[PDB]
Nucleic acid binder design. Structure first.
Lengths: 122, 205, 138, 117, 59
RNA sequence: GGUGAAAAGAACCCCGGGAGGGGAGUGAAAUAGAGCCUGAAACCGUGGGCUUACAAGCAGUCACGGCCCCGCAAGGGGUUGU
RNA sequence: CAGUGGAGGCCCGAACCGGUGGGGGAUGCAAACCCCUCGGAUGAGCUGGGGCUAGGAGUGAAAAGCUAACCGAGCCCGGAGA
RNA sequence: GUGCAAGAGCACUCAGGCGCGCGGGAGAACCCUCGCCAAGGAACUCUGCAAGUUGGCCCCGUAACUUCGGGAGAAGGGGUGC
RNA sequence: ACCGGAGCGCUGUCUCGGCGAGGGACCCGGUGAAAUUGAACUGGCCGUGAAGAUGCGGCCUACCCGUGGCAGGACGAAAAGA
RNA sequence: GGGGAGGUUUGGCACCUCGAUGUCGGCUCGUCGCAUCCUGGGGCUGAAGAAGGUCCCAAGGGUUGGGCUGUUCGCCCAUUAAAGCGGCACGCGAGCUGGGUUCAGAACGUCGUGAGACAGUUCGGUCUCUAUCCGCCACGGGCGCAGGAGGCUUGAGGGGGGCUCUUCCUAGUACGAGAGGACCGGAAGGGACGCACCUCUGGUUUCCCAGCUGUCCCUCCAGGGGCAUAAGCUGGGUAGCCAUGUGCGGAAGGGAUAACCGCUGAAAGCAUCUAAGCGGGAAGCCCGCCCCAAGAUGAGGCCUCCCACGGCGUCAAGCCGGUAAGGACCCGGGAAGACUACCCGGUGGAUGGGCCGGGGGUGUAAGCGCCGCGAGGCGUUGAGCCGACCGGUCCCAAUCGUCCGAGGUCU
């Protein structure tokens, strides 16, 4: 589960590699997150030459979780990591090079921009 | 305002139409339609319903083999459905039709005297910085020197479990009269051998 | 009422029996899915595996597999929305059922600690054309 | 309700097992054994089961049962004699019968292992 | 000896009530078949004995 | 600190492992029975009388009823239903 | 540069002294103690023996600590029935 | 006595010695003490208090500073059985 | 074994606690304390009172008694108030 | 510039407390108040609609996580539909925390000739397990309900329950220069939260399987035992127990009301929502929901059950032994349980233990064959064991049996 204290590496370029979770965006009490969850964040790890410096306070939505996901169809899956996709103050993935699998669940939520370039929808 | 008794077992997950669904299995069975109660000699309408037949030597006596028709009781004696009155024949299971939400009575399985942060869920706390003792203590209860009177129903550490309750909203797609079963959304309280009874929904009734 | 077993074993009329036979060794190819707002697809998700929780109706399998990024594990509800599922290699010769230890170090040590049983194959090749003898005899 | 499995107990685990099998030994030496009540109960259960797996006569039972035991002269007396007796019995080879008046000093109802054949 | 002390001497009335729920319970006995006298319900009296009669060895 | 004039300081039977008692026997007397003349108070028991299981108490008081037992009468104890 | 030698109020580390931060225990096993750890750890060391230093005095790797379980002035008895 | 680098350590156990001077049953909360914990990982808190990771043996290697002793076992990492 | 501050690996310190474990407790069995103690036949609101009542009053819930458990009051015990 | 509530702050007064009531916030449990922060409502605007400004109505529920400061006061971030103001020893150390506080130690700034002291600082520094009455949270016994008893029930009372958001369709339509951007009817989803379950997920399981280490022993090998936790150590792990997992709930609806808007209408020939009458009006009041509940001393009512004298009182009530329907003891014990209670069954029985088939856990075990000198290997084989599980099954224990219990008030 995603408490506001967790590291969340990135499954994309953007100019980042790892972060830390700040809050979520659900109810002012929804202190827990999973797949496709709208999460605020402070990067704490960003590689030298990109468009988002290390530390910088920005937002994101999460996919690829250490916490298994149980669909409405009895099936399930857990990702070996806590990755995500980063966004701005206008909801859109900043970078472009998406790495690894993603949940098609998110696709019906409505973040198709990742899904389009997604190399492994799962 | 229809209904019929039931006994508890299993809760699986069969996949209807496409999706995957948790499924409570209760045996509704043949239940003796033993007599109605009438608003003059009572105050309302009610039907006594028996259940699963075994009662021989052990139960006997006034039987209500008296009653008006005999028939002999189950082994699960009998109860009543409020504001209820079928036709007059001993009804069974498929008194309802698949794909309908309804209500259910059940004996919540007992647990006994149990924890304060367990029964109600307090918070307690003090692991290492607090004290070894007051791990599972209610912390505080009252006030100072006014009002100073401990409140009735101060939510206390005690028995939890062996209760009884009705429950709303239960979708049943499955039912096997061919053995007398009823499979619903799945939530029913009680042990696998206790009291259950299906009454009709109240979404707007 | 009797046998609760009898009850839930009668609840078994949504049973698959044509479904492949495997051990908690490897597995590989395909599973199923939906994929769209109108389904119309099943994903050919290969993998290894790990966890065979046995039950019968609700028995399920945790399938470990890795890709592009890293590790990932799909559990399947052994019975229905699985179209076909069929693995590839099967193999065998592990020590147990649960295989979490492979999550830690998954590499040359993993292929090192895995070897198929020729017995398996030999039995699938016995099954091979004792099934064209069964496509002949009876 | 922290007891919806059951099993009679009290003691250390070591204490439990060691006792169980020792009472067994003492019985297999004789037949009628004086003791308490819950002891009596899961004692009769355990030991009787032991005698059912000792009803046969393979190295299997030999070692296994005696892994959960010790005495070998008693392995003779069992595999060679006690088993060919209850031979045509596949049920309770032992019946533990209770005693009134209780154990004095601390009122404890008693009971007694039996050979039952 | 601590904080919650019996502030005052409890009355003889309270003595006798708290000791009202005290009391005893009589023994429970039945006869011994194929014998003569008692045995508590479900027992094999040494003097007497259940079915088949085991022990019975005294003086 | 005190048995009695004085030891006559309790044999023999009985239950009991003894202890201790139940009888007997002793003396004026064992309610003088052995740390025993006297034996109270607070005090813990057992019998009996009156009262108590819808009821708000510095616990009594004034009246009346119920009651049980002494009383020739008249009365008196007692007890508490309101 | 090699080596041998073999030093230290050397250092890690048993009984040995000690008692740090934690906890137990609190009418305690106990009028200062058990459990986990901490430190010294061949020296300014730990210790059975025999002798002396004692109440405006002794003893003080120094607090007004210690002197037969209460020490900003001991315990014992006497003025004193202050 | 067998065993690890070693040892007056430790596990097991020789010989010797004991079961801690009340027990039998439940299988409550709650309190002593012990283990496992998904997922997050100091967010709890005056305080990483405390537990819990590391550990021992050899191979590699070790910053600043330095009074050249050190810093050190720095850190960082590789093996160990049969 | 000195007081801050920060990062790394780790963890029930926290989220959010669940299971189990032995031992206390709980039932039986043998024995059996304490401080406090005027007596109590000892519930609550709204006011009353030398300022904070079961007890006064205009008034409350409730058969008699008990057992496990929590800790607000009896201006709660430790003192002839540090 | 006056008048006033409020008794929260900060001043004054000093009586119960000097035979003690232990001061700051936090842990944790609340809880009462509306002058209400979100949500409903309507009034109105220097209100187009979108939002806002404002005044009354209305506690029903709700009102976050952190950084720093011992710190309430505070600042700051990330958020919410919102980030309330307050009472109760500024609640709650016979509950925590003892961090802050006015101890002796020590140092420091400072005053004093100095001992030492300064509303100056610093570092460390012992709140004390058994509840007597009350109070409260469950559990019972004895009783009671003016024939004894068994089961189905009534609901007076009372307890619990009431949040809210997100995009969408209607429709970029109405209003508008544009930008914008709506009522309402409906929909789809999340979170916070209270109850229910194990079917999946995930955590478990103290002897249910496998591995190995130091070791003493049986019996040298093979094999096996304890010990090394209080299970030596790790690898797994059923049912039952659980959360994150899982099914639900807040509501849908009837009626009275709030401020507020209106109808018909007088005094007061005109007017009016008002003093008579009608109507709209809120999450709010009452039900419709869910448990307790007839000690509801009105002790309710239904479905039955058995039935009267059997022994003194003729009259008036007592009483008195065994029987009736029944029930109690004891036992098998029980997803039920602190004992009890409850509940299930007792030879006319599937209750516990044994047994065996289903089910679940482990991974070819004990031995045997066949290779390499040997660690081991392959075959025997998904075998061997096998805790709770579903049942079959009288093999063994629920023996024999013992005691109580209507004998029927009145009008």
């Amino acid at each position: 589960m995603i408490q506001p204290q967790t590291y969340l590496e990135v499954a994309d370029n953007t100019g980042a590699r790892k972060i830390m979770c700040i809050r979520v965006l659900k109810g002012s009490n929804a202190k827990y997150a999973t797949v496709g969850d709208v999460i605020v964040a402070s990067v704490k790890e960003a590689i030298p030459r990109g468009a988002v410096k290390e530390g910088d306070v920005v937002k994101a939505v999460v996919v690829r979780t250490k916490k298994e996901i149980k669909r409405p169809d009895g099936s399930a899956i857990r990702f070996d990591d806590n990755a995500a996709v980063i966004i701005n103050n206008q909801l859109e993935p900043r970078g472009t090079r998406v790495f690894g699998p993603v949940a098609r669940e998110l696709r019906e939520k409505g973040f198709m921009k990742i899904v389009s370039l997604a190399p492994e929808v799962l | 305002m229809k209904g019929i008794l039931g006994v508890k077992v299993g809760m699986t997950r069969i996949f209807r139409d496409d999706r995957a669904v948790p499924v409570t299995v209760i045996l509704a069975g043949p239940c003796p339609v033993v007599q109605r109660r009438t608003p003059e000699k009572d105050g309302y309408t009610a039907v006594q319903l028996g259940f699963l037949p075994q009662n021989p030597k052990r139960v006997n006596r006034p039987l209500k083999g008296h009653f008006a028709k005999a028939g002999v009781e189950p082994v699960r004696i009998l109860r009543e459905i409020r504001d209820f009155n079928p036709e007059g024949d001993t009804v069974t299971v498929e008194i309802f039709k698949p794909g309908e939400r309804v209500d259910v009575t059940g004996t919540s399985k007992g647990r006994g005297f149990a924890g304060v942060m367990k029964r109600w869920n307090f918070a307690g706390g003090p692991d290492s910085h607090g004290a070894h003792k007051i791990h599972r203590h209610p912390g505080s209860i009252g006030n100072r020197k006014t009002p100073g009177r401990v409140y009735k129903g101060k939510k206390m550490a005690g028995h939890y479990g062996a209760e009884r309750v009705t429950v709303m909203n239960l979708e049943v797609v499955d039912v096997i009269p061919e053995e007398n079963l009823l499979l619903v959304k799945g939530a029913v309280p009680g042990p696998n051998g206790g009291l259950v009874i299906v009454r009709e929904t109240k979404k707007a009734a | 009422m009797n046998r609760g077993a009898l009850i839930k074993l009668v609840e078994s009329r949504y049973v698959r029996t044509d479904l492949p036979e495997f051990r908690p060794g490897d597995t590989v190819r395909v599973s199923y899915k939906v994929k769209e707002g109108n389904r119309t697809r099943i994903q050919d998700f290969e993998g290894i595996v790990i966890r065979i929780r046995r039950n019968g109706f609700n028995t399920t399998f945790t399938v470990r597999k890795v890709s592009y990024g890293v590790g990932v594990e799909r559990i399947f509800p052994l019975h229905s929305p699985l179209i076909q599922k069929i693995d590839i290699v099967q193999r065998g010769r592990a020590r147990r059922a649960k295989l979490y230890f492979i999550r830690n170090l998954s590499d040359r040590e993993i292929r090192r600690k895995l070897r198929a049983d020729r017995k398996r194959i030999d039995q699938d090749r016995a099954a091979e054309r004792a099934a064209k003898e069964e496509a002949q005899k009876a | 309700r922290h007891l919806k499995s059951g099993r009679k107990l009290n003691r250390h685990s070591s204490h439990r097992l060691a006792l169980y099998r020792n009472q067994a030994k003492s019985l297999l030496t004789h037949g009628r054994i004086t003791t308490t009540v819950p002891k009596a109960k899961e004692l009769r259960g355990f030991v009787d089961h032991l005698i059912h797996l000792a009803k046969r006569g393979d190295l299997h039972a030999r070692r296994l049962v005696l892994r959960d035991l010790q005495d070998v002269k008693l392995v003779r007396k069992l595999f060679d004699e006690i088993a060919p007796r209850y031979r045509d019995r596949q049920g309770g080879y032992t019946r533990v019968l209770k005693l009134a008046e209780r154990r004095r000093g601390d009122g404890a109802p008693l009971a007694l292992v039996e050979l039952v054949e | 000896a601590k904080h919650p002390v019996p502030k005052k001497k409890t009355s003889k009335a309270r003595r006798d009530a708290r000791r009202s729920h005290h009391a005893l319970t009589p023994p429970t006995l039945v006869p011994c078949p194929e014998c003569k006298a008692m045995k508590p319900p479900h027992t094999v009296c040494p003097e007497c004995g259940y079915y088949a009669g085991r022990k019975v060895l005294e003086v």
